[PDB]
Amino acid sequence: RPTFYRQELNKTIWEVPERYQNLSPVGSVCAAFDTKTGLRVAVKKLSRPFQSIIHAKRTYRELRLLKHMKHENVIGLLDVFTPARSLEEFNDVYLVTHLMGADLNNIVKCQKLTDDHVQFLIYQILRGLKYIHSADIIHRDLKPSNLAVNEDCELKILDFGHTDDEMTGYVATRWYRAPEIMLNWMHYNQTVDIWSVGCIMAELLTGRTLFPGTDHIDQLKLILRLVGTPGAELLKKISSESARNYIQSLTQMPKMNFANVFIGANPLAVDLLEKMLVLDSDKRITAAQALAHAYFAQYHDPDDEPVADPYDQSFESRDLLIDEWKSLTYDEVISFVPPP
Ligand SMILES: CCN(CC)COc1ccc(Nc2ncc3c(n2)N(C)C(=O)N(c2c(Cl)cccc2Cl)C3)cc1
């Protein structure tokens, strides 16, 4: 058990192992320097981790997820600790990850990137996503602000999956969401993430948001105008009779010519975009198939695009008491083993 020291950071008391020095607030979260590894890190102190069933299960969920992800393009766990000496005294949870420079959103917003630049960034997103999906995990909330990238243009996927108010109106919180998930059309798959990737890729190519809807319905119109209104085949997969019914009230529209939308773009980028932005999620290209697309010929290496070990999330189906979620969380904290 290391030695911990106390420090108040904005009306917040932090108690962390001596190895972590020079803590400074960044959002709760502090950047620090881990003298044991020589790594600049981000330290998050969870706010009231076990105040309710929903919160206790959320804490367990986040810890299980982070402990599982071990990939260069996905945020992983460097350390997790509690100053608590036993389960009875257990109340706080601190999570340590690599400190990232800035998110994609804060970096290239309103800016058109070069094609080589787009290839590299999207390739890394797809490499991370192939790893995540292989574990049967769905990000569900990919957006430029959940993608961090350093100077060398190295990228990590962060913040896996929301307040209905924050999804209302002209907001980036909904612009990258697959239509089937935005309007709850059905039980969704992992290709919801691919739709997100297409929205991101287009924005990097044009410097412009692909479907900046002013609300849910305006966004659906922007989408259908580009990809076309649904055909009979997809209509049947929409479990919601009301949703299905609303869809049918719309004037039919054919899919637009993508080369005429992304004018001047690499023809290979245009082709991949058409394969990612397919309305019927059963037909979208998967992350693994995309990595093999000729657009990434310059980066693709089948021997350097690993998959994840199986991820047991049967716990999502369980209804336990706070003390039970708390005890499971504690076990995950003490059984933690740092990466090499
Ligand atoms: C205008 C306000 N400024 C202050 C100057 C804030 O700007 C920042 C603040 C931090 C960073 N880098 C940064 N790298 C890694 C993480 C992270 N922030 N954050 C915030 C987390 O929460 N991380 C995290 C997750 Cl996603 C899961 C579990 C544990 C952690 Cl620590 C990682 C970049 C810009």
- 242 CA to centre of ligand 1 in angstroms: 41
Beta strands, E only, 11-166:
13-17, 20-25, 29-34, 39-45, 79-81, 94-98, 147-149, 155-157
- List the CATH code of the domain at 102-307: 1.10.510.10
Residue type, 111: Q
Reference 79, options 106, 110, 49, 42; nearest CA is 42
- 155 CA to centre of ligand 1 in angstroms: 14
Domain boundaries, the chain: 1-101+308-337, 102-307
Instruction: Decide if 267 contacts 196 (C-beta within 8 A).
Output: no
Q: For the domain 1-101+308-337, what is the CATH superfamily, name and number?
A: Phosphorylase Kinase; domain 1 (3.30.200.20)
3-state helix, strand, coil in the chain (%, to 5): 40, 15, 45
Binding residues for ATP: 26-29, 44
User: Phi, psi (5° rounding) for residue 7?
Assistant: -160, 130
Specify the ligand 1 atom closest to the Cα of 148: 14
Give the active site residues. Answer: 159
Reference 269, options 247, 297, 233; nearest CA is 297
Largest Cα–Cα distance in the chain? Answer: 67
The Cα 287–Cα 136 span in angstroms is 13
Resolution of this PDB entry, in A?
2.1
Reference 255, options 277, 271, 239; nearest CA is 277
At which residue do the structure tokens 């082709």 appear? Answer: 271
Report CA dihedral (234, 135, 72, 149) to the nearest 10 degrees.
40
Reference 139, options 73, 48, 230, 215; nearest CA is 73
| DSSP conformation letters of 57-92 | HHHHHHHHHHHH---TTB---SEEE-S-SSTTT---
- 99 CA to centre of ligand 1 in angstroms: 7
**Residue 63: CB within 6 Å of ligand 1?**
no
At which residue do the structure tokens 């037909």 appear? Answer: 283
The Cα 13–Cα 222 span in angstroms is 48
Name the closest-CA residue to atom 25, ligand 1: 159
